[PDB]
Amino acid sequence: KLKLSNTVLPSESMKVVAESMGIAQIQEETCQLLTDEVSYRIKEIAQDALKFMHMGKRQKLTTSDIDYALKLXXXXXXXXXXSVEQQLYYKEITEACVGSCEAKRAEALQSIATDPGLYQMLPRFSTFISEGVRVNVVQNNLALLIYLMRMVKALMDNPTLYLEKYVHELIPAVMTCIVSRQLCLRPDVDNHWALRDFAARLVAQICKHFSTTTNNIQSRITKTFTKSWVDEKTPWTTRYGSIAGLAELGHDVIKTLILPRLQQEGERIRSVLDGPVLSNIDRIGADHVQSLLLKHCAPVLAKLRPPPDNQDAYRAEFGSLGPLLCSQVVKARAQAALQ
């Protein structure tokens, strides 16, 4: 069932190595038997280093190993998927997701991210997690939002629990967290922008795993945010969540998208800036949104264009980017100088 022929070096190459020292005119059978003899000693020593590492008990052979070799009819009532024990464990998980004590919070987060083999307090868990997402979208409460979104983050990093089959009741809750109207209070929309940042960051963590298949991920979320950006007369939370989600998709994504949207969204800027009579909620909202997305979009064209001619680059970017685009280009040159 096996045949072990002799691994014999080509003797002409051996004569090349030999007469590299300039020996003589060599006949073949000499170097043939030389390769034979050296192959015997090599394969003997190979068995020997195998005896080494099969008592050092590793199946990989290092240089050091050979160095040491060189010392020579009513049915029965049902039963759930849970145990009572692990469903009470699940209740601990849920009320720690409620948990005010941040120690209990982080305990829950680690318990999510590092319980592999759990898999069975899967979807039911995640399913009316998503239902709680919908109900608290109605309730419009940022604390439940941040708790669930860090919960989804910790769900995303528990490496065994594969997402695939159970994806499709989770991602829309993320995007509903992205879109709009996270309005606890009008002076307190501030944390919601960071919520959207974190959410789009989570989407970026999603998108690197699943769009090999059916392209729900890339094609649907991109066209979603595309036509969402097209949606005129919408609140700027929608615009921020859309453009932030497109920002999280990557360098070349923005290179495609904000190539016309550079000056088109600059037109949106100077529709907002030097714009209305008075709506300072929307003014301050859209203004810091445009500023954030400006200097967050900046490293694309910084990697794309050289940082010359900031007066021309503002003309190349409809003026309002100038010189905040130029200041971000100075910051990018400083970050390059840090390297």
Binding site: X79, X80, X82, V84, K104, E107, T114
Partner: protein
């Protein structure tokens, strides 16, 4: 893999000594081979001193031991102060690098339930019940007496009014008001041939 950085640290020492020499260029594989030769020279010192200070019944290799070792290993030690003028006085010492950490975690369930049960050994840590043990789910008691018979009687009332609505709109219908097919469509009279066999029949 993680062993390798000390070997490349020795390569850094090699480059430092070449800088003290003054070679602008080099042959890289020869440099690393010389580095291997250096670490084998270190280990050769160590083997020599190892088997040499076992000639005492005690272990600790002292200074003159290593003196006789290096003279045994062929070196004029008299240049060692003078080489100090080259060594710690013309080459800057490089620093080491080791970035070790112990991360934090917390997975607090509340179940131990057997500290050192019958196989008693007070050197372990019982995991939980949340992973190891299991349970059983019956999940449906529903035994609320008056509520139960409320359910049953309400359902009987439902089937009453259902069949009433069905044969109401089905058969001959006469009303209470005019044209109540919605609210009260009473079945009209059959009258049939033999009443007594019907009305006196259990």
């Amino acid at each position: 893999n993680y062993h390798l950085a000390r070997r490349r640290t020795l390569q850094v020492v090699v480059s430092s000594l070449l800088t003290e020499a003054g070679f602008e260029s080099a042959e890289k594989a020869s440099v690393e081979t010389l580095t291997e030769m250096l670490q084998s020279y270190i280990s050769e010192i160590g083997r020599s001193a190892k088997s040499y200070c076992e000639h005492t019944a005690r272990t600790q290799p002292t200074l003159s031991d290593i003196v006789v070792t290096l003279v045994e290993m062929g070196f004029n030690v008299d240049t060692l102060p003078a080489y100090a003028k080259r060594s710690q006085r013309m080459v800057i010492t490089x620093x080491x690098x080791x970035x070790x950490x112990x991360x934090x975690x917390x997975x607090x369930x509340x179940x131990x339930x057997x500290x050192x049960x019958x196989x008693x050994x007070x050197x372990x840590x019982x995991x939980x019940x949340x992973x190891x043990x299991x349970x059983x789910x019956x999940x449906x008691x529903x035994x609320x007496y008056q509520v139960l018979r409320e359910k049953a009687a309400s359902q009987r009332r439902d089937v009453e009014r259902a069949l009433t609505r069905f044969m109401a709109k089905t058969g001959e219908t006469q009303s209470l008001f005019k044209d109540d097919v919605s609210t009260f469509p009473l079945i009209a009279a059959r009258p049939f041939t033999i009443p007594y066999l019907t009305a006196l029949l259990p």
